[PDB]
Amino acid sequence: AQIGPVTDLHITNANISPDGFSRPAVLAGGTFPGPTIAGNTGDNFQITVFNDLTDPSMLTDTSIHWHGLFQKGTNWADGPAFVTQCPIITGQSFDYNFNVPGQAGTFWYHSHLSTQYCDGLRGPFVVYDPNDPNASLYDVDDDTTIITLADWYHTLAQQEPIGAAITADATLINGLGRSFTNTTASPLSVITVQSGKRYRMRLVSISCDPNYLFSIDGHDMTIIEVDGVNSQQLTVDQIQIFAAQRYSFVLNANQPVGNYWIRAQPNSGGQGFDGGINSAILRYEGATVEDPTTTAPTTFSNPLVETDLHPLADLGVPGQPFRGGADDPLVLNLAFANGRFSIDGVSFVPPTVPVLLQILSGAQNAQDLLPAGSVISLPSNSVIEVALPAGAAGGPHPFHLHGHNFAVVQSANNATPNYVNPIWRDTVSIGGTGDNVTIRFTTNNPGPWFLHCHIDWHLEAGFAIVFAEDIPDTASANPVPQAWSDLCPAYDQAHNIST
Numbered sequence: 001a002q003i004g005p006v007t008d009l010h011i012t013n014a015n016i017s018p019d020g021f022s023r024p025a026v027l028a029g030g031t032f033p034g035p036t037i038a039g040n041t042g043d044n045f046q047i048t049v050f051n052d053l054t055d056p057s058m059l060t061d062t063s064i065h066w067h068g069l070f071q072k073g074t075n076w077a078d079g080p081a082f083v084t085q086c087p088i089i090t091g092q093s094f095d096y097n098f099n100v101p102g103q104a105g106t107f108w109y110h111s112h113l114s115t116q117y118c119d120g121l122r123g124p125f126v127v128y129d130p131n132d133p134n135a136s137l138y139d140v141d142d143d144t145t146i147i148t149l150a151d152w153y154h155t156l157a158q159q160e161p162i163g164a165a166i167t168a169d170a171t172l173i174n175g176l177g178r179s180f181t182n183t184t185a186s187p188l189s190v191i192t193v194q195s196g197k198r199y200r201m202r203l204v205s206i207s208c209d210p211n212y213l214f215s216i217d218g219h220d221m222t223i224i225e226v227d228g229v230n231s232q233q234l235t236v237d238q239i240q241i242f243a244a245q246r247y248s249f250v251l252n253a254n255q256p257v258g259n260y261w262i263r264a265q266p267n268s269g270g271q272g273f274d275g276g277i278n279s280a281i282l283r284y285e286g287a288t289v290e291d292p293t294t295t296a297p298t299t300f301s302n303p304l305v306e307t308d309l310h311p312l313a314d315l316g317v318p319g320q321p322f323r324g325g326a327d328d329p330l331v332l333n334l335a336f337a338n339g340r341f342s343i344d345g346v347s348f349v350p351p352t353v354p355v356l357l358q359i360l361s362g363a364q365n366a367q368d369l370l371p372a373g374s375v376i377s378l379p380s381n382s383v384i385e386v387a388l389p390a391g392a393a394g395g396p397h398p399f400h401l402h403g404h405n406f407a408v409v410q411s412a413n414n415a416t417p418n419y420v421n422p423i424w425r426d427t428v429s430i431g432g433t434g435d436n437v438t439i440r441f442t443t444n445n446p447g448p449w450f451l452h453c454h455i456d457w458h459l460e461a462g463f464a465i466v467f468a469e470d471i472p473d474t475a476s477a478n479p480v481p482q483a484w485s486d487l488c489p490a491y492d493q494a495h496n497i498s499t
């Protein structure tokens with residue numbers, strides 16, 4: 001069952017064995033992935049998060065981010081630790097009370113403390129649209145049509161060396177999959193369809209690192225949504241999905257009744273499908289209960305290419321049709337050396353006082369804010385352009401901006417910008433050496449918004465900056481509840497920190 005929009009959510013430690021290997025984890029709602037949180041567009045969500053964690057090896061504090069939800073007027077509820085709040089301590093709870101005006105689509109929630117979401121705190125978050133303009137393109141859209149893709153590690157996250165190339169031990173599809181080494185024939189996930197029906201499959205990357213080549217043998221996929229943004233219909237036979245991205249696609253159950261492999265090949269870790277790694281099963285009602293016998297093609301003839309995507313609505317592009325054609329045109333210098341990432345010469349290390357609390361306490365320019373050199377102010381009601389030229393080790397890096405979606409003016413592997421009709425999204429691969437992936441948005445949401453690579457090991461190694469958007473209006477725009485004001489005193493008392 002789905003939960004929400006008003007619900008409790010308990011965060012616990014438990015043993016799980018999603019690939020046959022038992023390890024302890026950090027779980028929401030007692031499962032991996034966590035339960036789907038759902039509501040309708042414009043609803044009030046009140047997710048009262050109970051921190052019941054006791055195992056220090058995965059951290060007993062927590063904080064949860066609602067990925068892709070704009071949090072306009074509720075920056076305090078966004079979740080990134082030491083940007084918008086201090087962590088919730090064990091034995092305490094916190095009501096994330098916010099609204100989702102003007103958004104409808106496929107989202108997710110995850111821990112936003114250290115690398116804790118890798119240890120299991122990740123689940124789907126769906127905002128349905130009762131008047132969806134795509135409603136007539138499918139018959140079925142429910143909890144059974146959500147497909148999560150996850151990396152899973154046998155080593156606990158707090159034992160992963162900072163700045164290292166860290167590699168997973170299994171791909172999990174809907175929480176199940178097989179280990180790349182010491183492979184055992186543990187259970188695979190089954191997605192069941194009825195011959196002749198059309199399904200809105202909501203594909204969610206809950207990855208901490210790898211991108212996946214996703215396909216379904218015998219079937220093609222008609223994309224209708226990208227990171228919450230409705231798209232024109234685009235039919236593909238493979239989707240390369242980067243960490244934290246989402247797609248909705250129409251699956252037409254138009255092939256003979258039978259069993260078909262669902263494939264998710266990561267860019268690192270186990271390659272291929274031996275022993276049923278990187279796999280799940282599409283089963284038609286009436287098919288025999290047995291593994292598929294289907295083959296992938298040697299090459300995919302209609303893969304997703306990001307420049308093929310276009311919004312369903314006439315979203316356009318803000319600013320002027322050339323590089324630098326914005327009120328505030330930025331170019332970030334994105335680098336890696338010696339185990340640490342940097343942005344504009346500064347490696348991100350979380351501050352003691354959350355950025356939002358520094359601003360509410362009166363610090364009002366970005367050079368007054370900590371960490372020094374890690375906060376860039378943005379002017380209000382302005383067109384912002386951010387060029388993100390690739391080349392830093394560990395690519396391709398999927399960059400994500402909190403508080404906003406953005407026009408993808410230039411995509412990976414293509415030097416031509418699009419100032420007319422590019423897709424809008426919230427997480428974008430910056431590509432490879434010599435690329436110049438560039439995003440645009442307008443500043444209509446006061447508050448500090450994190451910008452970072454969504455490979456969680458890279459964020460931990462410093463690949464982040466904070467956009468302090470409209471500092472002067474942050475306090476008036478974002479009134480804070482007493483329970484939020486109580487978080488830093490409680491956290492600092494529990495941890496013997498002076499501030």
Ligand SMILES: *[C@@H]1O[C@H](CO)[C@@H](O[C@@H]2O[C@H](CO)[C@@H](O[C@@H]3O[C@H](CO)[C@@H](O)[C@H](O)[C@@H]3O)[C@H](O)[C@H]2NC(C)=O)[C@H](O)[C@H]1NC(C)=O
Pocket residue numbers: 323324329331387389434435436438
């Ligand atoms: C990605 O696109 C951005 C624009 O969106 C390019 O930025 C441009 O970068 C050049 C230098 O590479 C800038 O010109 C330089 O400016 C300094 C003065 O600030 C000057 O001292 C240098 O001699 C040179 O003129 C330019 O300001 C900047 N913005 C523009 C043109 O709008 C960036 O180079 C592109 N990166 C890649 C890898 O393609």
Ligand SMILES: *[C@@H]1O[C@H](CO)[C@@H](O[C@@H]2O[C@H](CO)[C@@H](O[C@@H]3O[C@H](CO)[C@@H](O)[C@H](O)[C@@H]3O)[C@H](O)[C@H]2NC(C)=O)[C@H](O)[C@H]1NC(C)=O
Pocket residue numbers: 305307414415416417418419
């Ligand atoms: C590399 O990225 C560029 C920019 O996104 C892509 O260029 C765009 O290509 C599309 C598809 O061909 C062009 O749209 C077409 O326009 C013609 C003429 O109006 C129209 O008859 C078709 O209905 C379609 O809309 C679009 O103009 C063009 N944009 C620009 C700025 O060049 C390009 O396709 C990408 N390269 C690859 C290999 O995918």
Ligand SMILES: [Cu+2]
Pocket residue numbers: 065067110244400454
């Ligand atoms: Cu996220």
Ligand SMILES: [Cu+2]
Pocket residue numbers: 065066067068400401402403
């Ligand atoms: Cu986010």
Ligand SMILES: [Cu+2]
Pocket residue numbers: 394395396397398453454455458459463
């Ligand atoms: Cu990265």
Ligand SMILES: [Cu+2]
Pocket residue numbers: 065080112400402450452
């Ligand atoms: Cu984030």
Ligand code: NA
Pocket residue numbers: 316317318319
């Ligand atoms: Na425009």
